[PDB]
């Protein structure tokens, strides 16, 4: 049976497809070390996935568009959570209790002009 999920974070958007029976992980038609190999924290995508274990009884296919290597990881983790909550009704309770369903939606601040440093004001004291 084909299980599916989507997610967004920090100027990225992801798609996740899961099928029962032994397979692998694929991201943008390559492995999780061919462009992701530079960074040190991509295993946040595995946080909801340990509840079915790392690809020993299922096959995982990922697509992601835009954003940096911490934004893409939060969007892929959201997509995995959105798929695994359909994979078992007992996980539909657990993934809500673990809070992985929660979205992080800020990235910037607004003006509110002027300020040369946008938020910091120039030195008041001295003389």
């Amino acid at each position: 049976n084909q299980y599916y999920g989507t997610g967004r974070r920090k100027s990225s958007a992801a798609r996740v497809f899961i099928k029962p029976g032994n397979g692998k992980i694929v991201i943008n038609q390559r492995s999780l070390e061919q462009y992701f190999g530079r960074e040190t924290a991509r295993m946040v995508v595995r946080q909801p996935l340990e509840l079915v274990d790392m690809v020993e009884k299922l096959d995982l296919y990922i697509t992601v568009k835009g954003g940096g290597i911490s934004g893409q990881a939060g969007a892929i983790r959201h997509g995995i959570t959105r798929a695994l909550m359909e994979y078992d009704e007992s996980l539909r309770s657990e993934l809500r209790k673990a809070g992985f369903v929660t979205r992080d939606a800020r990235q910037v601040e607004r003006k509110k002009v002027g300020l040369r440093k946008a938020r910091r004001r120039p030195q008041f004291s001295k003389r």
Binding site: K111, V113, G114
Partner: protein, 98 residues
């Protein structure tokens, strides 16, 4: 090979104008295409606020232009020839090109 553009500075005025091209294109015809809303193009400008001082913060402006291509499926004489010779399209700009 005759093509159209519809230009505006208001995102509802352009849709109200799109619907009257979608009317014109099916007033004698039967074939129509979906009008694409397209990414809005913007231009920004920063200037001194007033004819006296205010020398710690400049005043900021941003312009936003809405553009639609519409696509006419059958641009027949009894659909477009009177419109190419007169618009007759207020609050917007209609540009017809060959």
């Amino acid at each position: 090979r005759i093509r159209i553009r519809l230009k505006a500075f208001d995102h509802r005025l352009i849709d109200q104008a799109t619907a009257e091209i979608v009317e014109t294109a099916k007033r004698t015809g039967a074939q129509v295409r979906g009008p694409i809303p397209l990414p809005t193009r913007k231009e920004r400008f920063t200037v001194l606020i007033s004819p006296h001082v205010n020398k710690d913060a400049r005043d900021q402006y941003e312009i936003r232009t809405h553009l639609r291509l519409v696509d006419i499926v059958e641009p027949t004489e009894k659909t477009v020839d009177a419109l190419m010779r007169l618009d007759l399209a207020a609050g917007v700009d209609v540009q017809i090109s060959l």
